[PDB]
C-alpha cells in the first residue's frame, strides 16, 4: 500500500552467504572414514609444438583430489579456458576411502594444503590462518600418486618434503665449486626459476 519505497528502485541488500551442506563440517578427522574425489583435467586442444607441454602434463596420472568427511554427489563436467585452449574437468564419481590414524599425518596434510595457496598460487593474506574449526567451507586438497595396481594413494613424500616452498637463492662461484654436479634426472619434469635474471 505504501508508495514511499517505490522511489529507490536501485537498492540492494547484504546476504550472509552459506556454503553447500557437503562443504560444511567436511574437515577430515583422525580415526574416521574420509572420501577423496580425484580431479581429472582433460585437454581438448590438439597437441602442437606450442601446446605440447600442457597437453602432456595434464594427462599425467599424478592428479590431486579433494578430501571431505561428507560424500559428494555426482558433478557435471566443467569447461575451463586456458591460454592454449579449452579444458574439460571431471570429478570421479567413486570417492577414495582412506583412514587417517595419525594426528601429525592430518597436520602434514593441512600444512601442504595451506602451503599450496600460500606459495604456489599466492592467494595468501597476512591475516589468513589455517582453519581447524571443522566448520563452513572446510575441506582439503591432496596430491595423489600411483601405488599398488590401479589404486591410488596419498603423496606422503611430497607433503612431508614440501611443507613450505624453498626460497629462491643464488649460488656464487666459491660455494658452487663443491656443490654436487647437476644430474639430468633431478632436472626432468621439475620447476625451476632464474635467480640471476
Amino acid at each position: 500500500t505504501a508508495t514511499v519505497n517505490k522511489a529507490d528502485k536501485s537498492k540492494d541488500r547484504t546476504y550472509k552467504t552459506e556454503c553447500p551442506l557437503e562443504f560444511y563440517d567436511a574437515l577430515p578427522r583422525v580415526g574416521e572414514i574420509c572420501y577423496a574425489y580425484e580431479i581429472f583435467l582433460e585437454p581438448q586442444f590438439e597437441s602442437c609444438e606450442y601446446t605440447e607441454h600442457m597437453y602432456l602434463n595434464l594427462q599425467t596420472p599424478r592428479n590431486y583430489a579433494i578430501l571431505l568427511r561428507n560424500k559428494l554427489p555426482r558433478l557435471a563436467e566443467m569447461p575451463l579456458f586456458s591460454n592454449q585452449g579449452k579444458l574439460h574437468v571431471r570429478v570421479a564419481n567413486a570417492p577414495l576411502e582412506v583412514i587417517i590414524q595419525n594426528s601429525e599425518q592430518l597436520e602434514l596434510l593441512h600444512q601442504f594444503h595451506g602451503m599450496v595457496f600460500r606459495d604456489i598460487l599466492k592467494i595468501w593474506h597476512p591475516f589468513f590462518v589455517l582453519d581447524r574449526r571443522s566448520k563452513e567451507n572446510s575441506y582439503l586438497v591432496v596430491p595423489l600418486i600411483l601405488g599398488a595396481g590401479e589404486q591410488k594413494c596419498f603423496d606422503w613424500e611430497l607433503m612431508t618434503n614440501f611443507r613450505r616452498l624453498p626460497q629462491s637463492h643464488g649460488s656464487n662461484v666459491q660455494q658452487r665449486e663443491q656443490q654436487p654436479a647437476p644430474r639430468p634426472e633431478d632436472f626432468e619434469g621439475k620447476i625451476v626459476t632464474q635467480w640471476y635474471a
Binding site: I39, L58, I66, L75, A76, M78, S82, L121, I123
Partner: protein, 169 residues
C-alpha cells in the same frame, strides 16, 4: 604445478555446482518427480554447455514446452548445469548467466499471475487486475518471496578474483 594452477577456478565452480545440485534435488522432491528414473539415484549430470550467444564468448512446428506439458513422455530431467546457470548472475563474469532462462521465467510468471488473478477475481475491471498483476510480478514481491526461501544466500553474483576477494577453503 600446472594442474594446481587451475585449482581456484575448479573449487569456485564446484561450490556453486553443489548449490545447484541441492536446488535440483529440492525442487525435484517438491514436485514428487524425484522418484523418476531420470531424477533418482541414477542421475547422470550432463556437462555444462557454453553459451556462445554471450558477448564475451504449410505446417507449424509444435512447441516443445506445451508438447511436454500435455504429455509426460517428453519430460526431461532438470539439469544441474541449468540450475547453475540460473544461479549465476551476469555480474559474475562466467561463461553462462541467468538472463536467457530469466526471459522464459518472467513470461511464464506473467502468464500464470494473469491466469490466477482472472480465475480468482473474474468480477473485476481490468484496471485493478492489471495493477494487482504488476504488484505481484514486481521486483519487490519477487525479492521478498525469494528472500524468505533462503535462496539468495547461495547465489553466484560476484566476479571470481581469488587473489583479492576470495577465502580459500
Amino acid at each position: 604445478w600446472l594442474k594446481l594452477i587451475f585449482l581456484p577456478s575448479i573449487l569456485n565452480r564446484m561450490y556453486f555446482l553443489l548449490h545447484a545440485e541441492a536446488l535440483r534435488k529440492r525442487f525435484n522432491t517438491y514436485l514428487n518427480l524425484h522418484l523418476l528414473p531420470f531424477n533418482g539415484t541414477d542421475y547422470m549430470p550432463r556437462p555444462l554447455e557454453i553459451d556462445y550467444s554471450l558477448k564475451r564468448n504449410g505446417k507449424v512446428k509444435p512447441l516443445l514446452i506445451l508438447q511436454k506439458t500435455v504429455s509426460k513422455e517428453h519430460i526431461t530431467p532438470a539439469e544441474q548445469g541449468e540450475f547453475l546457470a540460473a544461479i549465476t548472475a551476469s555480474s559474475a563474469a562466467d561463461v553462462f548467466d541467468m538472463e536467457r532462462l530469466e526471459i522464459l521465467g518472467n513470461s511464464f510468471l506473467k502468464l500464470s499471475a494473469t491466469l490466477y488473478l482472472a480465475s480468482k477475481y473474474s468480477d473485476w475491471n481490468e484496471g485493478t487486475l492489471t495493477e494487482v498483476k504488476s504488484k505481484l510480478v514486481s521486483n519487490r514481491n519477487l525479492l521478498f518471496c525469494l528472500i524468505d526461501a533462503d535462496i539468495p544466500k547461495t547465489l553466484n553474483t560476484i566476479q571470481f578474483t581469488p587473489r583479492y576477494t576470495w577465502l580459500p577453503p
